[PDB]
Amino acid sequence: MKHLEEKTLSTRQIFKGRYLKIEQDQVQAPDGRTYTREYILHPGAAMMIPLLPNGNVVMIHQYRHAVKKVFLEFPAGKRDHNEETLLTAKRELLEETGYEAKDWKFLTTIHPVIGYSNEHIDLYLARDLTHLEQRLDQGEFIEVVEVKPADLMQLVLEGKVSDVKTQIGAFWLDKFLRGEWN
Amino acid sequence: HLEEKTLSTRQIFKGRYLKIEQDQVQAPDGRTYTREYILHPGAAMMIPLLPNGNVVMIHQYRHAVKKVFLEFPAGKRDHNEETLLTAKRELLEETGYEAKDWKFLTTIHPVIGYSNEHIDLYLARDLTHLEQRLDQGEFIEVVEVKPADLMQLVLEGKVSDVKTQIGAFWLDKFLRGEWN
């Protein structure tokens, strides 16, 4: 769909905060005119759907100050210096929840902020789990929970799983558990 | 127990589009940390279901990711208006359609780590086809999509836009008689 593409004419890093880095670009759009585009430079991420032998999934509660709310989430974290996201996922599953998994399957990649960040999140299904113990980062506060997939889907419908990556995980899990996508 | 207490707030950056809030917070360990996030106006996204069973979707380039995306139409809340008003306006501007039947589905948060953005998702039915009225810097092509085709595209990784993918999943639940 080449007639929709925009051509980068210039880029700069316009701002660096404590955490957020902003790129500002001038682009040539399909009209041949120049427009500004601004977006966050993000390292990428992974998220894991950790399926226990008992059929429950391992989830977390975590407070997110950007939204001033505690969210139910699948474990996740940012990609460290261009590592494969499978490594990110293994590490985050262990650090946030204490689990390791013998069976990892890449499901899909999502883009959560197409208007203003280059973030992508690779979503994985982790099976054949065994437990060790949690190891949280400085400034990271997490409660680990087990959730029945049926209860999770009802929470989705009720608006109680508003975190996009985790809601998408729930729907992919549902497709997997029903044997539709497996 | 997990909640962090705001100690101070500052708008540290305002560009052409993006505004960054930086807060000092006291966390559950009693210690102080910085939190940085985008101040976003909020947004609406619309699933427009045609009488033939297809949905109206768009193709749109997104410079932040350097790809053309398949999306449901959407846009940002203006002057803190009711998001249904946002939805009705953006459905007309981006696709050329109006709808006489609107239903709120759910609110999603696409960037919990670094933006206060929420998106309210709506189902739109009973449609009338007028014409697009695109805004500055907007280039959008309208396409009709069969929901079964949409779900296969999701599986294939060809619907990576979170809001759109979630919309597909909700539509699938509605069309299957599961959620109504």
Mutate to test the interface with B, among A25, A28, A65 (most CBs of B within 10 A): A65
The four Cα atoms B89, B91, B93, B97 give a dihedral, to 10 degrees, of: -120
Instruction: Match 């261009």 to its residue by tokens.
Output: A82
Nearest to A39 by CA among B115, B17, B23: B17
- The pair of structure tokens assigned to B159 is 């619907």
Q: Helix B147-155 crosses helix B162-175 at what angle (to 10 degrees)?
A: 130
Which residue, B151, B143, B152, B134, is CA-closest to B72? B143
CA-based max dimension of chain B:
58
Residue A3 exposed, middle or buried by CB count within 10 Å (0-12, 13-18, 19+): exposed
CA dist A80 and B52 (Å) reads 47
Q: How was it solved?
A: X-ray
Residue with tokens 């975590």: A62
- What is the per-residue DSSP string for A80-131? PTT--HHHHHHHHHHHHH-EEEEEEEEEEEEBS-TTTB---EEEEEEEEEEE
Q: A68's torsion region: left (phi>0), alpha (psi -120 to 50) or beta? A: left
Instruction: Give A168's DSSP letter.
Output: H
DSSP state string for chain B: ----EEEEEEEEEE-SS-EEEEEEEE-TTS-EEEEEEE----EEEEEEB-TTS-EEEEEEEETTTTEEEEE--EEE-STT--HHHHHHHHHHHHHSEEEEEEEEEEEEBTTTTTB---EEEEEEEEEEE------TT--EEEEEE-HHHHHHHHHTT---BHHHHHHHHHHHHHHTTS--
Alpha helices in chain A (DSSP H): 85-97, 149-157, 164-177
Cα–Cα dist A125/B35, whole Å: 30
* CA nearest to B3 within chain A: A63
Residue of A nearest to B117 (CA): A67
**At a CB cut-off of 8 Å and minimum separation 6, what does A139 contact?**
B27, B31, B33
> Cα–Cα distance between B105 and B102 in angstroms, integer?
10
Half-sphere exposure (Cβ direction) of B160: Cα atoms closer than 13 Å: 24
CA gap B62, A34 in Å, rounded:
15
Chain CA centroid to CA B45, Å = 5
Count chain A–chain B contacts defined by CB atoms under 8 A: 183
> Across the interface, which of A1, A116, A168 has its CB nearest the CB of B18?
A116
Domains of chain B with CATH codes: 1-180 (3.90.79.10)
Q: State the resolution, in angstroms.
A: 1.5
Task: Tell me if residue A153 falls in helix, strand or coil.
Answer: helix
d(CA B79, CA B88): 15
Nearest alpha-carbon partner for B142 in B13, B51, B54: B54
Task: Report the amino acid identity of residue B130.
Answer: L
